[PDB]
Amino acid sequence: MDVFLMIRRHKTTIFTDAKESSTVFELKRIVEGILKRPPDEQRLYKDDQLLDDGKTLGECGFTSQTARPQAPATVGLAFRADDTFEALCIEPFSSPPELPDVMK
């Protein structure tokens, strides 16, 4: 089964898909091809939880029911910077304006 994701780090968001049976490491190879950082210099998260490279996306909770094309699941990304990995920081999207009176 396919899962639809948003790999997010600071102000960068990668929209990609993968199989439920594919691993966390295979998802790092995707990030490597785009952001040019090797998998060993990347950390992936589901919320505040660090994910193990050998675990499948399905095992990490990324399922066809919760990682849909129209509502993809979020995977957090933190790179290594010199000696240590930086803190996981994901910049939120902009706030929509107040609904007009004619829409409330």
Added chain:
Amino acid sequence: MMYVKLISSDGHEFIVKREHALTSGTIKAMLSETNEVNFREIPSHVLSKVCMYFTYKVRYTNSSTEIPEFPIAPEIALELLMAANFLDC
């Protein structure tokens, strides 16, 4: 596997597959070497949703299976309409 970068008015960089971005006829005209597009009028709360539409469209176009509704929050509908009209998608 090729990707393109769509940058929102507030600086959010969205990296989507090239095939998916080519859904918007507007984007296809400028691309189909060049793989970075700035949208100084489209904020991230709208541009992120446009990217979700591309994935949705590529996935469900010509599908035999049941197609789910594409969800749009009332708060973003007006801005998303303006972006979709420019993007021709």
Added chain:
Amino acid sequence: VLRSVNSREPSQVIFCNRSPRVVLPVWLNFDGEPQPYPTLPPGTGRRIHSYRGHLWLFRDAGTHDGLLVNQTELFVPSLNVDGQPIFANITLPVYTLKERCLQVVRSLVKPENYRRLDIVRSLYEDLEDHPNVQKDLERLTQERIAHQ
């Protein structure tokens, strides 16, 4: 041009709503006039009695948004092989993002207040141009004319 042919040969059909909308089945009568039939709640099916060569289209019963039947616009009942009823699978089309946005805005704003929105003039006209079966039948006949 777009009308049911008066065959008088019964054909059983299963109208199957595989969409989240309330479906309004519309039969094109012998003069080509759309005739509405009882609605179908989302995810439900009905076994119905129609005739060979009759034409049907399907809409959202509340907004008149276009729906697909067997991945196309019109459904024509055919001959029941071994008494098997014909399946008419009603589904949502992949609407354009623009049309989907128009659908959501129309659902939140009363038509009186469209002109009160902070949008360009062309989008007011797009909003006011509500989905219409008669307008779609005009478009469909025009398209069949382009085919010599």
